[PDB]
């Protein structure tokens, strides 16, 4: 899709083998914010969003948190607190043709900057001046979109690049997108290093008597620390007691 009309695919309820991506040699840009790619294998998320589009090379830099320019402002805006990956690779072989491929567009004018993950696909005539356009182009009345000039002979800066942006949903809900990391058996009444759905800690897991609701995933202490969980594989509730310690 064009950058102004970037596609969004939702990923849910599956195992994400991210090795296939970071071990592939097909990508020029693999930039992960608020996360390390390798670690992805150990992590779960409620949702993943793959935002796909095409831009020119020199604009790849605009696909990053708190960037400015035509793309970052009018086409596709990342939040300043973005937590995810940006993958980009040259697509000169596919998206360029002799004579110039103009199927790919970008928004050139807009009355305001886009909000993070805002999608504007409107074709309203931009009123550059004081005269209302009334949907009629002319002086100070321009079409908001413009084509990319993608020829095979174009400079690498102007060559087409396919971009996928992965956003990860670290929320307080059940996580359906997990890494390939295998599960193990559960041990009770012992000091253990536990990992539930990426939620790591060290404690003693005991049968709880807490009345979790059918929906409630895990519980917290006064300190906003995890005190009790629901096993992802078993609808069983466990209290976590921190491993016995004391001053000596």
């Amino acid at each position, epitope marked *: 899709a064009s950058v102004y009309a970037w596609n969004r695919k939702r990923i849910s309820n599956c195992v994400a083998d991210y090795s296939v991506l970071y071990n592939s040699a097909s990508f020029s840009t693999f930039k992960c914010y608020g996360v390390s790619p390798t670690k992805l294998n150990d992590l779960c998320f409620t949702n993943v969003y793959a935002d796909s589009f095409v831009i020119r090379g020199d604009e790849v830099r605009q696909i990053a948190p708190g960037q400015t320019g035509k793309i970052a402002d009018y086409n596709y805006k990342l939040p300043d607190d973005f937590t995810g990956c940006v993958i980009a690779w040259n697509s000169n072989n596919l998206d360029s043709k002799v*004579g*110039g491929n*103009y*199927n790919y*567009l970008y928004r*050139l*004018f807009r009355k305001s900057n886009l909000k993070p993950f805002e999608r504007d696909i409107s*074709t309203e*005539i*931009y009123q550059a001046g004081s005269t209302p356009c009334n*949907g*009629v*182009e*002319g002086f100070n009345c*321009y*079409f*908001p*979109l*413009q*084509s990319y000039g993608f020829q095979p002979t174009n400079g690498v800066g102007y060559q087409p690049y396919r971009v996928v942006v992965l956003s990860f949903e670290l929320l307080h809900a059940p996580a359906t997108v997990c890494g390939p990391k295998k599960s193990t058996n559960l041990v009770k009444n012992k000091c253990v290093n536990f990992n539930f759905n990426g939620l790591t800690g060290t404690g003693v897991l005991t049968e709880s008597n807490k009345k979790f609701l059918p929906f409630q995933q895990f519980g917290r202490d006064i300190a906003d620390t995890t005190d009790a969980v629901r096993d992802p594989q078993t609808l069983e509730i466990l209290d976590i007691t921190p491993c016995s310690f004391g001053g000596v």
Partner: nanobody, 127 residues
């Protein structure tokens, strides 16, 4: 690729009016703009009128402004040139052209090299 087929050319008396048609087939979803051009015997090809596919805003050469009207029917993938107040100087072969290039600036369609061209239709204006 698109195919452009013009029709409606012929002999008309000065002061009369005539509508040319250009039917687009093939990759019709790609259409950004259509343009009409004309070539008189012994003269260079000359821009007449262009229309943006989305919105239908029109741009005209000075020689035809106020006389000619360009229109398009999206559903039928057809562009029309309504040639009112015909003059001797309008005698020429008229060509329709299509581009998938989107310019922010309508006036650029006057000079843009287009992608696909019709076969041409002869208009002859009688004294």
């Amino acid at each position: 690729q698109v195919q452009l087929v013009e029709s409606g050319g012929g002999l008309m008396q000065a002061g009369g009016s005539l509508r040319l048609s250009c039917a687009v087939s093939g990759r019709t979803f790609s259409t950004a703009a259509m343009g009409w051009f004309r070539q008189a015997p012994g003269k260079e090809r000359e821009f007449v009128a262009a229309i943006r596919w989305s919105g239908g805003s029109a741009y005209y050469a000075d020689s035809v402004k106020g006389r000619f009207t360009i229109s398009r029917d999206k559903a039928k993938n057809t562009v029309y040139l309504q040639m009112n107040s015909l003059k001797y100087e309008d005698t020429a072969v008229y060509y329709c052209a299509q581009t998938h290039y989107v310019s922010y600036l309508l006036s650029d369609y006057a000079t843009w090299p287009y992608d696909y061209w019709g076969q041409g239709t002869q208009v002859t204006v009688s004294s």
